[PDB]
Write a protein that binds this ligand. Structure first.
Ligand code: GEK
Ligand code: GEK
Lengths: 225, 229
């Protein structure tokens, strides 16, 4: 099963997460502006390195490193092989491990691309605090998540739109689909208001949504210079 | 002639300068599938060449609907009527040259303001949103897509820079019209998401939320209650 998820992951995420590919492209554009020479980037919950490779293709400074981490050995196996397929001047530390345990040092950029929802709600403040402290001045965090909505009528609409999206995209063709819809119904999501409040609570002077499509989106958080 | 020249290059100009525009058009069509009711009207306000109109129309599977597409640019209208006439569908379209500040909104299951409100003076915007709310049937939807400003200036600067990079990646400046249209864009006054939501609330919408965003451009959906008077 973890290998099966790892095998199909790109196609699964494409068919289930509206705007994913857009976010990944925007992550690259941000990297081009925010990765400073001699600094590092963290990809927290890296899966197969989709965000890592997007950053990496947009770093043209010397002496950087990306640190990519996932606690799934199936994802890590495959991410290390996938990253070895592409040539670039920035090396990557692919580390199998727990994001709640790893230190964040000298970071011009941090990426939580559909990863925070996997922690228990009560552990989410403490990861964000750490990322904040670990970011250099002027550094950026990207936080992409499935959102819940406090207005139940809007929530219903967006749930329906998401369902229509999955239908349009042949989501049910995937063998793994039944077990992934089971995960989504068991997952604990937060609202944008909740995400913003936690970011501010971590120390972030600036945060805003920079992407949304239906019930999925991404915030950018900026540490003052 | 600037009018005719914009209309001629419009699809490419919008594609190179509005991030998310095609995504929004697709979302509009999705929303139409669920929201357009038999025997009702849809309004496309500031229709340009009819892109939003055609997206809705392709997603209407019910009888006795009508779409009303309105713009006050003669060059946009002429081409929009021709563009609509080029595609077969059961739902008819009234293509009207006129001002959306003047037009009545009746029996509407859906109304679309896809990059149009920004072209009115700020002091005209509330009145138009009030009229839309009143003219929507209960359960109906407004789509409001805009270039936003940001109340946090550091975020605003960032998203301004990202928009710049987007236009550069897409060769926007290849277009002869780009210099003049960039300038005219910097003259129309944009509002924050907070302002948009406040306006929607004060027009009477019981529910509203951002449903799309990409950098400094995005889209709100606003719903009239099913039990509304
Ligand atoms: N505590 C944890 N520590 C480390 N990894 C974890 C933990 N909990 C979950 N994971 C890992 O977080 C990843 C989530 S996926 C990220 C997409 C990727 N970012 C992408 O941009 O393509 C999105 C999804 O599957 O919805 C999985 O690979 C888990 O192994
Ligand atoms: N007061 C007015 N009354 C009527 N029309 C107006 C008025 N003011 C401006 N317009 C018209 O509003 C349209 C704006 S475009 C709309 C895109 C379209 N919705 C699309 O989804 O492709 C976006 C852009 O030009 O950036 C133009 O066609 C104007 O002539």
């Amino acid at each position: 099963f973890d290998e099966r998820v790892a095998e199909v992951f790109p196609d699964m995420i494409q068919r289930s997460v509206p705007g994913y590919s857009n976010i990944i492209s925007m992550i690259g554009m941000l990297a081009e502006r925010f990765v400073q020479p001699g600094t590092q980037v963290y990809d927290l919950g890296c899966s197969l390195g989709a965000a890592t490779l997007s950053v990496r293709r947009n770093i043209h400074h010397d002496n950087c490193k990306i640190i990519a981490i996932d606690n799934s050995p199936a994802m890590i196996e495959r991410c290390r092989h996938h990253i070895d397929a592409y040539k670039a001047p920035t090396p990557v530390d692919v580390i199998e491990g727990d994001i709640r345990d790893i230190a964040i040092e000298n970071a011009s950029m941090v990426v939580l691309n559909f990863t925070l929802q996997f922690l228990e709600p009560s552990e989410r403040q403490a990861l964000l605090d750490k990322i904040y402290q670990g970011l250099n001045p002027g550094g950026a965090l990207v936080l992409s998540e499935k959102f819940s909505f406090e207005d139940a009528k809007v929530g219903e609409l967006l749930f329906n739109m998401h369902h229509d999206f999955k239908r349009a995209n042949g989501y049910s063709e995937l063998e793994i689909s039944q077990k992934r819809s089971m995960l989504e119904n068991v997952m604990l999501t937060d609202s944008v208001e909740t995400h913003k409040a936690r970011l501010h609570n971590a120390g972030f002077e600036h945060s805003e949504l920079w992407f949304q499509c239906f019930n999925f989106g991404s915030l950018v958080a900026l540490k003052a210079e």
